[PDB]
């Protein structure tokens, strides 16, 4: 009875690098305000 | 310095959770 609407998802290496960068730079930006 | 001690866990999870999400999506892309 399998559902026909499922799809594979992807994230290529360049998107990993871009996302990891965004997250680290956001954390580096906000951490001073979290420690306050 | 008298900083906020939930700052450490807030920063650690802010990094860890979204990072792990991306790593999960990337590794399962490579193996398919």
């Amino acid at each position: 009875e399998p559902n026909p609407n499922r799809q594979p998802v992807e994230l290529n290496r360049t998107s990993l690098y871009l996302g990891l960068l965004l997250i680290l730079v956001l954390a580096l930006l906000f951490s001073s305000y979290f420690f306050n | 310095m008298e900083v906020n001690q939930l700052g450490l866990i807030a920063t650690a999870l802010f990094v860890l959770v979204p990072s792990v999400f991306l790593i999960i999506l990337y590794v399962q892309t490579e193996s398919q």
């Binding site: 360049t14 680290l24 951490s31 | 900083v3 450490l8």
Partner: peptide, 30 residues
């Protein structure tokens, strides 16, 4: 704890640079 946290994040970014340059997806003419 806060100095360590700042330096650790910065160090992770520098490591990321290394991989992003030297272990990039190679561009190839397709």
């Amino acid at each position: 704890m806060e100095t360590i946290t700042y330096v650790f994040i910065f160090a992770c970014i520098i490591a990321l640079f290394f991989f992003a340059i030297f272990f990039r997806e190679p561009p190839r003419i397709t």
